[PDB]
């Protein structure tokens, strides 16, 4: 798009507009929007921000790493501030490519038995991996791969949520930064312990999260769901790699999970290696899966 | 019943973001009909929730009636259009002077006078003593949850409160799971550790380890010796009070009643003047 500037905080007038009526009290909810110049739909994350946070947002935007677009990433369109008079708070807008069919989590929640068919898991997992491969080659770690951050377009295209990942813009607004988020999709290396005191992310941390997302697609929830988050945090580096509960799954799927879920990131395969895994590489029903997913989308849209 | 909750249209308007009790945001709310101020904790009702907010509202109305706890007014449901969750509005007492964190950040040198720390710490302890006798653990004592009214009254907010971990800096060692503590216990005494961290925050402008990434702070809290005031300027009674709050093993940590008898808390002859001095600061902070 012609009027996109990812390096500056601008007024959205004449660039983007909300289509849904946005009320009072926003803190990260996503609304249908539109690119004014092209008419193309957009997803707009809206947050009420203080005058102080706006100054901070400006610096964070300067630190945004850049990367070309990719069919498996919901294109990030920038950050905007919609001004209010002094005293009353302004609103930060984070703008992204619109994905109509909702998240992978909603898809599984809406599916009978909260389990997706294996060939659907293979298709979705490959698209996630292709999205990650693109970020990784540009030296960007997603950091929040989970079913809720993997979206479907109307045409069953798979896209990773990008509301400014290379500077975690959506997890800093209302002091959500000082906070440890949800731990269920966290790799062992991102959690500090005796052998790992400097809990440092690596590109490979996204691959562990991708494996947890594949279990989430298979069982409707990540392995340590409902457990107090502090206990999940203690158990992740200690427990054996999570494994699918049901015996119904193919050997290739169990094998794919073993690849993602190597606890020691130094021994965990790269995104390129996981893309060559038979579960991902061999998809002869790929044409049909898209058709099957596209029908599930159109049937839930009523 | 949750269905009995009315729409806030024509009753309350959201003015500006004041805090965050995450879940959701906290707003300075203006009563449309009277012009009177209130704090509004806005949250999306997944429902799901149902019992979760029902028991939050239940404990808000049950325990808000103590001079050291901000009083609960009522609740509203802002019905949202399809495709979005409805919003729950919890209306609370607006504490005009803001949080003790803001107070210290606005103070020159990011340090409060010792007799102010003693006064604030005692009111926190009195608020905690009320919750503890009613078998309630606050679980989130920190400068951001300790507020000052315009009359320099000290009030606690966001008590008795879930798949995410908040900020870890004020967490007691027992609330953090490790080899020797796999269960991550919450005891009434966990609030006392947090109270000690809040006293350091009042003294230095930030809790110990504020620098560290939250995950690293989480690893260091059970390992590091009890935090201690950096400056040598503080009195021995204040160092002694911190030693009392900051006993790492909660089984050996004094109760709220024992800490209320500590000389730093018990001996406050300038109590009348401190309130005057605090009221002066808050009324001065108007620009
Ligand atoms: C409930 C839960 N978490 C935070 C709050 N914050 C406030 N509440 C009341 N007055 N006030 C003035 C400034 C900030 C606040 C309340």
Curated annotation (Swiss-Prot), chain B:
Protein name: Mitogen-activated protein kinase kinase kinase kinase 4
Residues forming the catalytic site: 140 (proton acceptor)
Distribution of this protein across tissues and organs: Widely expressed. Isoform 5 is abundant in the brain. Isoform 4 is predominant in the liver, skeletal muscle and placenta.
Quaternary structure, from the entry: Interacts with the SH3 domain of the adapter proteins Nck. Interacts (via its CNH regulatory domain) with ATL1 (via the N-terminal region). Interacts with RAP2A (GTP-bound form preferentially).
Gene: MAP4K4
Binding site for ATP: 18-26, 41
Annotated source species: Homo sapiens
Subcellular location as annotated: Cytoplasm
Superkingdom in the source lineage: Eukaryota
Biological role stated in the UniProt entry: Serine/threonine kinase that plays a role in the response to environmental stress and cytokines such as TNF-alpha. Appears to act upstream of the JUN N-terminal pathway. Activator of the Hippo signaling pathway which plays a pivotal role in organ size control and tumor suppression by restricting proliferation and promoting apoptosis. MAP4Ks act in parallel to and are partially redundant with STK3/MST2 and STK4/MST2 in the phosphorylation and activation of LATS1/2, and establish MAP4Ks as components of the expanded Hippo pathway.
Segments forming domain Protein kinase: 12-265
Family in the record: Belongs to the protein kinase superfamily. STE Ser/Thr protein kinase family. STE20 subfamily.
